[PDB]
From Swiss-Prot, chains A, B:
HAMAP family documented for this protein: TruA
GO molecular function terms noted in the UniProt entry: RNA binding; tRNA pseudouridine(38-40) synthase activity
UniProt keyword Transit peptide present: no
One GO BP: tRNA pseudouridine synthesis
Function: Formation of pseudouridine at positions 38, 39 and 40 in the anticodon stem and loop of transfer RNAs.
Known catalytic reactions: uridine(38/39/40) in tRNA = pseudouridine(38/39/40) in tRNA
Family under the similarity heading: Belongs to the tRNA pseudouridine synthase TruA family.
Organism ancestry: Bacteria, Thermotogati, Deinococcota, Deinococci, Thermales
Species of origin: Thermus thermophilus (strain ATCC 27634 / DSM 579 / HB8)
Name this polypeptide is given: tRNA pseudouridine synthase A
Length: 249, 249
């Protein structure tokens, strides 16, 4: 009837992930679908992607179909009265009846935040990875550059097996000296990502930043695509799905 | 026996306040004193100030007495293994056995965060005051200016019995366009503050920013020290105790 693109922000700490999983488990998709009826929409939400348990989102897109006559500009506010405090709709747009949040996406962007300081931070404990040791940003930037472009990224995926060639469009490191302390931010942009990939890339880069054979080691993992050569997956609370882009119309 | 000056950071949302309040409530003092014996210290902590339920601190000073031989360098880590996830020591320094965190403070600084944006922010729901309507930033600065200097701030106070005269050294607005929206930070620094004073000044300022008689109306509040004229107290989650300064002696 009317199909809308909903942008959602969520604190993923108290969710078992985005995808609805059954057996009572609390999920982002589950909670958005639980509230769609309240606005005259079918209880079905198709997401642009999938976030693991604990990972956050700034503007995760979902398309939904509303039977009702609610004006678009009224949808966020209305769904927000119904949604829990850790998941809110921060935008809505009328799209083509044809629109598909997952398939029509040009690209997806993620951001990982590391907070470098002598002591843990109660204020940012679920928002950034606390790292006590000094970090070698130069070694990290040289490894980051190895990841750019067309590669088989399976060496960084998780329970992933599937056709692994992806093309990383962007992989940059930013240091922003916040008050809660100094932060190192890793940004990644690509059409799509393997499941677990970003957290995978981040854990090995972190190893680079401390001590772990130089950026050089990342060429083997990209070449062979052998998971046992990467480092451990970075914790979920420092990861954020930033946004997805779609072609005009 | 040594007297140490501890600096603590805490997420105030799951605390009834800083000082003990009985009634079996969880407070910052309670939890710190709970941990202190694991370091061979007397289970007593005196803070530089007070924070209501929900308000935060980046560096709240506390003085404690340690009996053990523990090196100053090691107490933040030792206390942190024992403390809850929402409260940690981020600094420790030996001082005079005669040092008083509250009485010897030259000044205290506070910061309040307002985030102006169309929709709520689940990620910053316990860190900034969400405000939808734009803020007359001009009026707020005019009002802020009327607050600087020596006055009887009891009109901004709540349940205080001390002498109302204080000297507000700094009172400034800082706006930054940010990723989560427009960040409006209010900063205050004075020798000391009355109970509820900072939240009352912030609450009256929000009214100005939104539509409270002009900034002028704060004159009446300072002259008469009548709290009946002040605005509602500001929600706690946007307030942060930043730091305190002591004399080098």
């Amino acid at each position: 009837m009317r199909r809308l693109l909903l942008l959602c922000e969520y604190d993923g700490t108290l969710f078992a992930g985005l995808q609805r999983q059954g057996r009572g488990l609390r999920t982002v998709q589950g909670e958005l679908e639980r509230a769609l009826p309240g606005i005259g929409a079918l209880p079905k939400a198709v997401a642009a992607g999938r976030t693991d348990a604990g990972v956050h989102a700034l503007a995760m897109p979902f398309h939904v179909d509303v039977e009702s006559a609610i004006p678009v500009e009224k949808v966020p506010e209305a769904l927000n009265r119904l949604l829990p405090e850790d998941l809110k709709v921060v935008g809505a747009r009328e799209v083509a009846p044809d629109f598909h949040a997952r398939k029509d996406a040009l690209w997806r962007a993620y951001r990982y935040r590391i907070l470098v300081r002598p002591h843990p931070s109660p204020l940012l404990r679920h928002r950034a990875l606390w790292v006590r040791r000094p970090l070698d940003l130069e070694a990290m930037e040289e490894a980051l550059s190895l990841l750019l472009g067309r590669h088989n990224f399976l060496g960084f995926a998780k329970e992933e097996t599937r056709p692994g060639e992806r093309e990383l469009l962007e992989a940059r490191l930013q240091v922003a000296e916040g008050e809660a302390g100094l932060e190192v931010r890793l940004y990644f942009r690509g059409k799509s990502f393997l499941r677990g990939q970003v957290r995978g890339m981040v854990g090995t880069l972190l190893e680079v930043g401390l001590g772990k054979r130089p950026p050089e080691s990342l060429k083997a993992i990209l070449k062979t695509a052998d998971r046992r050569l990467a480092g451990p997956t970075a914790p979920a609370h420092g990861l954020y799905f930033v946004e997805a882009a779609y072609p005009e119309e």
